Write a protein that binds this ligand. Sequence first.
Ligand SMILES: O=P(O)(O)Oc1c2c(c(OP(=O)(O)O)c3c1[C@H]1C[C@@H]3c3cc4c(cc31)[C@H]1C[C@@H]4c3ccccc31)[C@H]1C[C@@H]2c2cc3c(cc21)[C@H]1C[C@@H]3c2ccccc21
Ligand SMILES: O=P(O)(O)Oc1c2c(c(OP(=O)(O)O)c3c1[C@H]1C[C@@H]3c3cc4c(cc31)[C@H]1C[C@@H]4c3ccccc31)[C@H]1C[C@@H]2c2cc3c(cc21)[C@H]1C[C@@H]3c2ccccc21
Ligand SMILES: [Cl-]
Ligand SMILES: [Cl-]
Lengths: 230, 230
Amino acid sequence: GAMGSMERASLIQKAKLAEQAERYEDMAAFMKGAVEKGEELSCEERNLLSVAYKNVVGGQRAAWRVLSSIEQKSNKGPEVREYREKVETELQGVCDTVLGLLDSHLIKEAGDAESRVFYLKMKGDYYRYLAEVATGDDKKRIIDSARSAYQEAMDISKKEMPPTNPIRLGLALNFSVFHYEIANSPEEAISLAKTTFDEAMADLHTLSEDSYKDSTLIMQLLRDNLTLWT
Amino acid sequence: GAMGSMERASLIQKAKLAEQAERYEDMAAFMKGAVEKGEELSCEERNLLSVAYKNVVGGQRAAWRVLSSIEQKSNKGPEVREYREKVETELQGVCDTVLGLLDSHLIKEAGDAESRVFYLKMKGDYYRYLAEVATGDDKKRIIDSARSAYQEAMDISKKEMPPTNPIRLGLALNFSVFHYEIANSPEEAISLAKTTFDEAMADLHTLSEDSYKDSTLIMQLLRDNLTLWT
Ligand SMILES: O=P(O)(O)Oc1c2c(c(OP(=O)(O)O)c3c1[C@H]1C[C@@H]3c3cc4c(cc31)[C@H]1C[C@@H]4c3ccccc31)[C@H]1C[C@@H]2c2cc3c(cc21)[C@H]1C[C@@H]3c2ccccc21
Ligand SMILES: O=P(O)(O)Oc1c2c(c(OP(=O)(O)O)c3c1[C@H]1C[C@@H]3c3cc4c(cc31)[C@H]1C[C@@H]4c3ccccc31)[C@H]1C[C@@H]2c2cc3c(cc21)[C@H]1C[C@@H]3c2ccccc21
Ligand SMILES: [Cl-]
Ligand SMILES: [Cl-]
């Protein structure tokens, strides 16, 4: 790789500087380099990886939506289709890269439950992004790959984590978005979101000092989605 | 070039779609392709060229400032200097490209006064951006190149345009920023900004329907700078 000659510690240091400069493509490329050294990621390093790639595909998804909607209003030439296809191909490339890193280096049968749930949630998120732009018989394959990763993550977090854990809360929030937008199961989405909120409020005594901010933010987002789906 | 096989009309169409999707790198590359066909740009096309490249270098300048300030707080390793140099080199590449297009294709002895002033202002803006990151004896050469382009633009706009013309107003606004930030002449900056505002207000009867929005915006920015420099 292009980062093969740089020290692991230097790549992590530069990913942080790229975050502060809002240079998210650079950030993602530095973290890919770090992962390719073959060592495990710390809790802090996992978050750098996630923030980098989330910001890159987020910008691609927003552009793809603007162009896809303009394309449909034509019903002008081949130009809109051509440019929409170009952004699509680039988005698919980024998703394939992240999923490649998850299968090659990061997902393991061992490690703590925080680690395994984090990478399986990530695996679900990026199959979900591929599902938003797919159409064929492969779309059905992609949706079942997303559901499967999300469901194994849910099973582990119910056994191993308290209901106020922010990784458990975020997982359930995104899996409920999967139900509503991709699976067309709005009842199953509403249900999952309400019980996630309710079960956290019933066992507030488990709330940790170090994740008061993160957990609270995700509770508000769960409620905002329920307001919208009523 | 990479856009050599595409029709002129298709490149202009795709630059507009890229604007709507906030894909400013694509936008700039499509407009470079359009310029390289060798025909003049319309008023609307000139604005597409300007908006594309302004947005690209704007993001680079903001990152360069965040990293340059972090670097100075070290007084930790070579990592901050190395990454700051990388963003700098990339910023200089974009400025050289724009200045190359201006000298090769766009700046002419003929054409209307709106055209000539527009490209000379652009020439000043991008030498100004190179001056922000330069240090040596070449910095002095770069500042004099910026002043010279800006001054020839001012001379033409005073003879050929009314004092409420938004291209004339924008030119003077940016030339006053050049005085304050790059030339360290805060008196000369304050003076130019006040007389630009005052002379527009004295001759309000020249204000055009098609530029009421643009001219008004730039008047407010001239006043906001004066509030700051008092
Ligand atoms: O240092 P931490 O334990 O990791 O948590 C704090 C943070 C921060 C803190 O200070 P700051 O937000 O003024 O910049 C704090 C904390 C701890 C110490 C201080 C703070 C303040 C507060 C809480 C925890 C913390 C509880 C009570 C108060 C608060 C407001 C909103 C939600 C949760 C809380 C920064 C840095 C970090 C943080 C996180 C966020 C945000 C900002 C921060 C933004 C985006 C996200 C967030 C969630 C909810 C509301 C607003 C935000
Ligand atoms: O169609 P145009 O003649 O080119 O001008 C109008 C515009 C627009 C118009 O509608 P909009 O701003 O509600 O979206 C208008 C015009 C003409 C017709 C309507 C409008 C409204 C107004 C004016 C001119 C126009 C004068 C009086 C009122 C106004 C408010 C602020 C500054 C100047 C004006 C859009 C599109 C365009 C425009 C430009 C701007 C903006 C928005 C627009 C933003 C960013 C910049 C701006 C400058 C000052 C304040 C706010 C803005
Ligand atoms: Cl294209
Ligand atoms: Cl670097």
